[PDB]
Design a protein around this ligand. Structure first.
Ligand SMILES: [Zn+2]
Length: 147
């Protein structure tokens, strides 16, 4: 009843609605992977790195990088998440003075995008033209990376 195109997925990897789709082979998200011991927020500077799921960190368990508009970052998350960027809620972005690249995500079009955080707070995508995440419609984050 959200009436959206792109599904969100539970912590077992099952879509809450619609058909499942696979992640891009070169995305930083590697599935299958466990998640959901807690909802643990973090910051851009301290995003978890590859390998961190083994030991976790001082904030608690780590499953990977999650992001939603705000921007808000998590190192683990329990609720439904996007496995692909929901391009229905993105639009063309204008120039960004300073960016931080945080991963590589599959788009809802099946294509591979670099994902960034702009200094203005916007979440940006670039293929391999820039798009920005303008609508936090479902308030579900995008699972960017498996740690
Ligand atoms: Zn892992």
């Amino acid at each position: 009843h959200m009436g959206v195109e792109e599904p969100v997925y539970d912590a077992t990897g099952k879509p809450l609605f619609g058909d499942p789709s696979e992640v891009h082979p070169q995305s930083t998200l590697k599935l299958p992977h466990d998640r959901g011991r807690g909802n643990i927020k973090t910051t851009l500077k301290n995003l978890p790195r590859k390998g961190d799921c083994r030991s976790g960190n001082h904030l608690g368990p780590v499953s990977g990088i999650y992001v939603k508009p705000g921007p808000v970052f998590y190192q683990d998350y329990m609720g439904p998440v996007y496995h692909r960027a929901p391009l229905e809620f993105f639009s063309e972005a204008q120039f960004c003075e300073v960016t931080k690249r945080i991963g590589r995500v599959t788009g809802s079009d099946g294509r591979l995008y670099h994902i960034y955080v702009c200094i203005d707070g916007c979440i940006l995508l670039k293929l391999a033209r820039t798009l920005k995440w303008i609508r936090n419609f479902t308030d579900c984050p995008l699972w960017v990376t498996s740690a």
